[PDB]
A paper describes a structure:
N-Methyl-D-aspartate receptors (NMDARs) belong to the ionotropic glutamate receptor (iGluR) family and are ligand-gated ion channels that mediate the majority of excitatory synaptic transmission in the central nervous system. NMDARs function as heterotetramers composed of GluN1 subunits (with eight splice variants 1a-4a, 1b-4b) and GluN2A/2B/2C/2D and/or GluN3A/3B subunits. Hence, GluN1/GluN2 NMDAR activation requires binding of both Gly and l-glutamate, whereas GluN1/GluN3 NMDAR activation requires only Gly. Each receptor subunit has a modular build with an amino-terminal domain (ATD), a ligand-binding domain (LBD), a transmembrane domain (TMD), and a carboxyl-terminal domain (CTD).
Near the PPDA-binding pocket in the GluN2A LBD, the primary sequences across the GluN2A-D subunits are mostly identical except for four residues, GluN2A-Ala414, Lys738, Gly740, and Arg741, which are Arg, Met, Arg, and Lys residues in GluN2D, respectively (yellow residues and arrows in the sequence alignment). Here, we found that GluN2A-4m LBD protein can be recombinantly expressed, purified, and co-crystallized with GluN1 LBD protein in the presence of Gly and l-glutamate as in the case of GluN1–GluN2A LBD heterodimers. The asymmetric unit contained one GluN1–GluN2A-4m LBD heterodimer assembled in the back-to-back orientation nearly identical to that observed in the previous GluN1–GluN2A LBD structures. GluN2A-4m and GluN2D LBDs had nearly identical overall fold with a minor difference in the Loop1 region. Only minor differences in side chain orientations of GluN2A-4m Arg740 and Lys741 were observed compared with the equivalent residues in GluN2D (GluN2D-Arg765 and Lys766). The GluN2A-4m showed drastically increased l-glutamate potency (EC50 = 0.61 ± 0.07 µM) compared with GluN2A (EC50 = 5.91 ± 0.77 µM) although not to the equal level of GluN2D (EC50 = 0.17 ± 0.01 µM). Nevertheless, the GluN2A-4m mutant mostly but not fully recaptures GluN2D-like functional properties including high l-glutamate potency as well as selectivity of UBP791 and UBP1700 over GluN2A/2B.
Author numbering:
A (entry chain B): 5 to 284
B (entry chain A): 3 to 98, 101 to 289
The structure:
């Protein structure tokens, strides 16, 4: 009861991967765990149904280890009110919002630790290193986020075409730090990572700016090893993914010690080899 | 209220320690950007040899961690006084007797000799059982320092994993690296080799690699990469075999701990931390 926790996640391969359940036997198998998704009946009603799906991936394996070590059970669900988390008219949506508004005891996923989120939720120790990286076709001459081609894009003719996936930690950082860059970039907003890689590969974008851990993975998997992150995977604004918990959560202490134990015992390295390797 | 007692440790480029001038002040110097180097007076033992008295003298302290302290104190509006850890160590928990005790900066923080550790202090499970760490102010890991020309592939090299007295390697006593090798049973062959050779300080180990008295030094990459960048007779080898971060250390009931972590996050996000890296860590090659 008090040991059985509502937990929220969000698909973002390879950290969280969602699969359809076998119509028979309506059971999740192999390395997967049950995860439900609220799906609307139509757009003229608030009626919806939870759909039973199956979840796996690097962060799901972390959750499994935490459940075993810290001794809790859980009911995992996928967020439908936004994505990772954005404050809109002073109200948090996404995984952060689910925790703030007490619909979830914790959020487990590719959830970036930053200052403004830490004002409304508690974060565990970082368990995956991340930050902001820049993906380009191999050889592209950009030094980093502070390259003038990004900071003063109209000082070049034609200007560099670059964008991010809006409404997450990367856009929030660029909006605050580089106002001119930010208002230029929004015309190149990408709906998601997969769209952005297509845009790069077909020459509609010159650079994609995004979460470092996801971008470095996508570079390792790129067909032909043509797309790279700059600086051999350099990271601006270094941070990590953290488990988000409600402020003052009684679970934070044991989650922190468990994650630190996993790192110190080498258990994290095997998860990295299992989920995050690629040819390039 | 009261000024905070800050404990730190000599560890270039995070903390440099130099004598005061004759008048008891710290010489005015300027960074590689031309800006003044911020220095603080830090007291610490005049004799650092083992088993010796630790009567103290004022000294000058500066570096990445001292710049970070100054920023934290300005942000959260506390005053402070800095001293160097009396026993020269970062901190491990050792059996005494069935008691255990913490040494190093860890022991000073838990005993009240310090109120905050500001140093390249590795966040790990063992220490977090007893103190509060901030979110990391630096992400790094472990690597291996050797003399230029020495070829070892990394942590899985047979000269490490099947050791003999023909190839000596070591780390710093009573450090997080000591803890790491003592903890993992799969590393016990290496741990037993290193226990015969571990050094009292990183500086002494690095000097011993230069003098060909130590063939490999296993230590923090943030430190070893800096050393290699300045001393071209030294190189790192094998790339990071473990990843870990440095955090500010406080007692679990410190009133400052929430805002210390928020300030660290803010500094990563607005480029302050990267400016410190440009000033102190990467600028040579
Ligand atoms: N991990 C990011 C999402 C991707 C990004 O914006 O870089 C977040 O938690 O907001």
């Amino acid at each position: 009861d008090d040991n059985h926790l509502s937990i929220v996640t969000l698909e973002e391969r390879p950290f969280v991967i969602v699969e359809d359940i076998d119509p028979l036997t309506e059971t999740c198998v192999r390395n997967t765990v049950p995860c439900r998704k609220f799906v609307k009946i139509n757009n003229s009603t608030n009626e919806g149904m939870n759909v039973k799906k199956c979840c796996k991936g690097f962060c799901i394996d972390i959750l499994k280890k935490l459940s075993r070590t810290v001794k809790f059970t859980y009911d995992l669900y996928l967020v439908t009110n936004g994505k990772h988390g954005k404050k809109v008219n002073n109200v948090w949506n996404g995984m952060i919002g689910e925790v703030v508004y007490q619909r979830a005891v914790m959020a487990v996923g590719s959830l970036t630790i930053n200052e403004e989120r830490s004002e409304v939720v508690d974060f565990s120790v970082p368990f995956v290193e991340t930050g902001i990286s820049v993906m380009v076709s191999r050889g592209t001459q950009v030094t980093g986020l502070s390259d003038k081609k990004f900071q003063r894009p109209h000082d070049y003719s034609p200007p560099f075409r670059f964008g991010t996936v809006p409404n997450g930690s990367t856009e929030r950082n660029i909006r605050n730090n580089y106002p001119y860059m930010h208002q230029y970039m929004t015309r190149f907003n990408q709906r998601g990572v997969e769209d952005a890689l297509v845009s790069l590969k077909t020459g509609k974008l010159d650079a994609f700016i995004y979460d470092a851990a996801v971008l470095n993975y996508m570079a390792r998997k790129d067909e032909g090893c043509k797309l790279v992150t700059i600086g051999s995977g350099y990271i601006f604004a270094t941070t990590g993914y953290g488990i988000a918990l409600q402020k003052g959560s009684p679970w934070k202490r044991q989650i922190d010690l468990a994650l630190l134990q996993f790192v110190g015992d080498g258990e994290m390295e095997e998860l990295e080899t299992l989920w995050l390797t690629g040819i390039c | 209220s009261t000024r905070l007692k800050i404990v730190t440790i000599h560890q270039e480029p995070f903390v440099y320690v130099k004598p005061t001038m004759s008048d008891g002040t710290c010489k005015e110097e300027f960074t590689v950007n031309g800006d003044p180097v911020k220095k603080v007076i830090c007291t610490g033992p005049n004799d650092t040899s083992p088993g010796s008295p630790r009567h103290t003298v004022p000294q000058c302290c500066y570096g990445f961690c001292i710049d970070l302290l100054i920023k934290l104190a300005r942000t959260m509006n506390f005053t402070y006084e800095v001293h160097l850890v009396a026993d020269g160590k970062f901190g491990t928990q050792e059996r005494v007797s069935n008691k255990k005790e913490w040494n190093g900066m860890m022991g000073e923080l838990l005993s009240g000799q310090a109120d905050m550790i500001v140093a390249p202090l590795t966040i790990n499970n063992e220490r977090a059982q007893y103190i509060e760490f901030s979110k990391p102010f630096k992400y790094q890991g472990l690597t291996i320092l050797v003399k230029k020309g020495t070829r070892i592939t990394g942590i899985n090299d047979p000269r490490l994993r099947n050791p003999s007295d023909k190839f000596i390697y070591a780390t710093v006593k009573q450090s997080s690296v000591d803890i790491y090798f003592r903890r993992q049973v799969e590393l016990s062959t290496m741990y037993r080799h290193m226990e015969k050779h571990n050094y009292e300080s990183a500086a002494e180990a690095i000097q011993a690699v230069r003098d060909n008295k130590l063939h490999a030094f296993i230590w923090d990459s943030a430190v070893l990469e800096f050393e290699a960048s300045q001393k071209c007779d030294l190189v790192t080898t094998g790339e990071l075999f473990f990843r870990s971060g440095f955090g500010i250390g406080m007692r679990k009931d410190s009133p400052w701990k929430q805002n210390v972590s928020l300030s660290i996050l803010k500094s990563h996000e607005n480029g302050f931390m990267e400016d410190l890296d440009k000033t102190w860590v990467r600028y040579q090659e």
